[PDB]
Amino acid sequence: GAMGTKYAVPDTSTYQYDESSGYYYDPTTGLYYDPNSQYYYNSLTQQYLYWDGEKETYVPAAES
């Protein structure tokens, strides 16, 4: 690792709040950030995800 930063920690300060939708648009990955729940919304699979700093990936927030 170290010399291969593929997926860093996303900062929702680089996001675009879509007022019409009510979500923060994530151009980084292509997801929707819910400001209230603080989770990521996959608009294709309609699922919720969160960023894990260790796995460097988005894991389903609905632990099931």
Side-chain angles (χ1 to χ4, degrees):
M3 301 302 180
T5 44
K6 305 177 182 65
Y7 286 95
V9 291
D11 66 292
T12 51
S13 310
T14 54
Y15 289 28
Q16 303 178 90
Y17 177 77
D18 193 281
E19 66 176 279
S20 193
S21 189
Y23 290 93
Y24 283 87
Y25 173 65
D26 166 67
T28 332
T29 324
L31 295 182
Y32 280 104
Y33 174 80
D34 190 273
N36 195 266
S37 314
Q38 295 177 212
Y39 292 119
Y40 292 96
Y41 178 66
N42 188 328
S43 183
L44 179 61
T45 323
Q46 304 172 150
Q47 67 183 92
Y48 278 77
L49 301 159
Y50 71 95
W51 176 258
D52 181 86
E54 182 59 85
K55 302 179 181 184
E56 297 180 273
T57 189
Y58 299 91
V59 211
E63 299 178 275
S64 40

